[PDB]
Every structure is written in C-alpha cells, then in structure tokens.
Design a protein around this ligand. Structure first.
Ligand SMILES: [Cl-]
Ligand SMILES: [Cl-]
Length: 91
C-alpha cells in the first residue's frame, strides 16, 4: 500500500538466496540476483530493490560490510525493508 515492502525471510539450508551490492560513489546497498524458489523469492524480494532496514535498523548509509554483517549475524530470520529506488528517495 503506502508502507515500504517488508520481506521476512526464514534462513534455509542454502542461505537466503540473494546477492547484496553497492555501487562506486553512490553509497547504498541493493538486492541483486534473487534465486528462484528461495526464501528471498518467497518473501517477495526483487533484484533492483534498495535495502533500507535490516531487522528494524536503518542501513541506508552503512558500508557494504556493515550491512552484510548484520544480515549474517541474525540467527533464524531477517526482516528486510526495501523500496523501489525509482519511486523512493531519502532527503
Ligand atoms: Cl541482478
Ligand atoms: Cl517503494
């Protein structure tokens, strides 16, 4: 609706099933390569999505390493708050 899409994935045997990546100069992390049939795909993630929060914490301006660390440390699940970058901007 109005709220950013919230994607709640349960960690599977083969991880979550998606890549995360930044872009030189333009800080920020983005979903990339979502595997068919994975938690990521089941939870609604889409390559192209920008990652705003991981488990209720703002990671919009955090390094690639910080964000991956956070995602990786959670135990069973991660809630990923994403927006479509063509429709959302931070000010
Ligand atoms: Cl991709
Ligand atoms: Cl959005």
């Amino acid at each position: 609706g109005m709220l950013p899409r919230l994607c709640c994935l349960e960690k599977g045997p083969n991880g979550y099933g998606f890549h995360l990546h930044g872009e030189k100069g333009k800080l920020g992390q983005y979903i990339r390569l979502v595997e068919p049939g994975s938690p990521a795909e089941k939870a609604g993630l889409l390559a192209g999505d920008r990652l705003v929060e991981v488990n209720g914490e703002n990671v919009e301006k955090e390094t690639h390493q910080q964000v991956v660390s956070r995602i990786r440390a959670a135990l069973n699940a991660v809630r990923l708050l994403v927006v479509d970058p063509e429709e959302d901007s931070f000010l």
